[PDB]
From Swiss-Prot, chain D:
Family as reported in the entry's similarity comment: Belongs to the BET family.
Places the protein is found: Nucleus; Chromosome
Annotated domain remarks: The first bromo domain specifically recognizes histone H4 acetylated at 'Lys-12' (H4K12ac). It also specifically binds histone H4 acetyl-methylated at 'Lys-5' and 'Lys-12' (H4K5acme and H4K12acme, respectively). The second bromo domain recognizes and binds histone H4 acetylated at 'Lys-5' and 'Lys-12' (H4K5ac and H4K12ac, respectively).
Ranges that cross the membrane: none
Organism: Homo sapiens (Human)
Bromo domain segment(s): 1-109
Consequence recorded when altering L39A: Reduced binding to histone H4 acetylated at 'Lys-12' (H4K12ac)
Protein name: Bromodomain-containing protein 2
Remarks, miscellaneous: Some specific inhibitors of BRD2 that prevent binding to acetylated histone are promising therapeutic molecules for the treatment of cancers or inflammatory diseases. ABBV-744, a small molecule, has been tested on tumors with success: ABBV-744 antiproliferative activity is mainly restricted to cell lines of acute myeloid leukaemia and prostate cancer and is able to displace BRD4 from chromatin. GSK046 (iBET-BD2), which specifically inhibits the second bromo domain, is a promising therapeutic small molecule for the treatment of inflammatory and autoimmune diseases.
Gene: BRD2
Shown stretch of the complete protein: 345 to 454 of 801
Self-association state and partner proteins as the record states: Homodimer. Interacts with E2F1. Interacts with (acetylated) STAT3; promoting STAT3 recruitment to chromatin. Interacts with CTCF; promoting BRD2 recruitment to chromatin.
Known role: Chromatin reader protein that specifically recognizes and binds histone H4 acetylated at 'Lys-5' and 'Lys-12' (H4K5ac and H4K12ac, respectively), thereby controlling gene expression and remodeling chromatin structures. Recruits transcription factors and coactivators to target gene sites, and activates RNA polymerase II machinery for transcriptional elongation.
Annotated effect of mutating N85A: Abolished binding to histone H4 acetylated at 'Lys-12' (H4K12ac)
Length: 111, 110, 110, 110
């Protein structure tokens, strides 16, 4: 019970979670564990946390109304990363590699 | 807020600055499809977008908020990804410039 | 019809041609408030328009009919009359170019 | 019973009918007398005749919804003239002078 756009979004999600991107996808698979890392300010700066398993949860529950909502969550995840972090951190470069995969596949969606 | 649109204007200035010219130049003006020999560009890309258009819209005060500004900038990158195969030089350049944009846009005070 | 929009494209080419360049040049690109130092231009003119914007809209296929094209050209001329006093050179130039546009637009098929 | 905008339009119409502009307004005071002029094809080419007396009556009867509808009638009158005539005819030059008065005053509307 998915539209053809959201079927394509599910394909993108599946692509993002696949083995070939794991080397740069892994920091986004589960929520950032800010307390464990001692990032005391993380939740003061990031008011809407997002991660790939949350997106998956939402997709499996049929919560996305259209492709634009799916895209907004995925971009939120990357934006949180860029917002919180300095430009030289490993995680920013990993975000950028994964976002290239996302944006490119998202732009090839059918009309 | 005008303060949000002011910071979007700073972002736009950054994207147009000389330091990024090596990967930003293809996005300064609309794709000249007939010069390039692209008979199908306007068939495939229904809503073209480029930095000069975003400039004009910013100077005209056409953007209600930062979200509209970002939607045009991302429309520009998406058009590029949509039209092109992944190995084309312009795609590599789009990705370099989008990294500048996304990083700066995420640091916007809100 | 595409034949009416094709005729509109012909008018646009006529307005951009060298023959009219002595009076058309202020309308080629958007009014550059900065270069002119006009802090109130975008306060008074809410919807700027110019010939390159019209051209980009034509290339992008944003015009649904000839009336929409005409509306933009007339908006361009109206902004100029609105902002300026009657004895400024730009108003005389606007009027000469509008005479070309209105005449050619009146000769459209159907 | 007239809005601020239509009140301004009524002011415009008064100006177009005033003695000041009579030397180039007179051919538009009343319909083109095609029998008298010997124009057997005028009503084939011009499907919607329009003159300043028509606009006056519509204004008096409150048949204008808005200023845009008013503008459309006045512009129809000028377009009919440009449509039927070659560019060197005296009536075209008279139409152009009167249209300059109209377009300028219309652009100064509240
Ligand atoms: C801390 C860290 C060191 C590295 F060398 C590489 C990465 C990816 C890295 O990031 C993470 C590692 C593990 C985990 C957990 C514990 C949840 O599995 C999360 C991250 C991590 C994920 N995301 C999305 C982030 O935005 C950030 C940010 C940080 C981070 C940690 N310390 C900082 C410093 C930089 C100034 C604050 N940022 O760590 C992560
Ligand atoms: C065509 C091309 C060859 C290169 F080697 C490098 C670039 C950047 C490049 O792209 C452009 C070069 C010039 C111009 C001008 C200045 C004429 O408007 C535009 C582009 C260009 C900009 N943008 C945003 C694009 O999306 C594309 C896409 C293309 C393009 C041209 N030919 C293709 C092939 C690839 C499949 C069809 N894609 O060219 C551009
Ligand atoms: C300023 C000016 C002096 C001249 F002698 C002739 C022209 C055309 C002229 O107008 C322009 C010159 C350059 C440019 C550039 C290329 C920078 O965008 C624009 C104009 C111009 C174009 N259009 C369409 C306009 O409506 C106006 C209006 C003005 C203008 C500048 N200063 C005024 C004074 C009078 C009201 C305040 N009006 O300038 C332009
Ligand atoms: C025919 C003519 C000769 C001139 F030397 C000057 C004018 C204004 C002029 O136009 C008119 C003169 C009188 C009248 C009367 C009062 C009889 O209704 C009408 C016109 C006239 C008004 N308007 C709005 C027009 O569009 C046209 C068009 C013409 C016209 C007459 N013959 C032509 C042919 C000649 C090649 C085109 N056009 O005449 C008028």
């Amino acid at each position: 019970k998915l539209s053809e756009q959201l079927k394509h979004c599910n394909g993108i999600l599946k692509e993002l979670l696949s083995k070939k991107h794991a080397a740069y996808a892994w920091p986004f698979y589960k929520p950032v564990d800010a307390s464990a890392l001692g990032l005391h300010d993380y939740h003061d700066i990031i008011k809407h946390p997002m991660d790939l398993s949350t997106v998956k949860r939402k997709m499996e529950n049929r919560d996305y109304r259209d492709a634009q909502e799916f895209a907004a969550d995925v971009r939120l995840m990357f934006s949180n990363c860029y917002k919180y972090n300095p430009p030289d951190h490993d995680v920013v470069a990993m975000a950028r590699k994964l976002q290239d995969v996302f944006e490119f596949r998202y732009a090839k969606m059918p009309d």
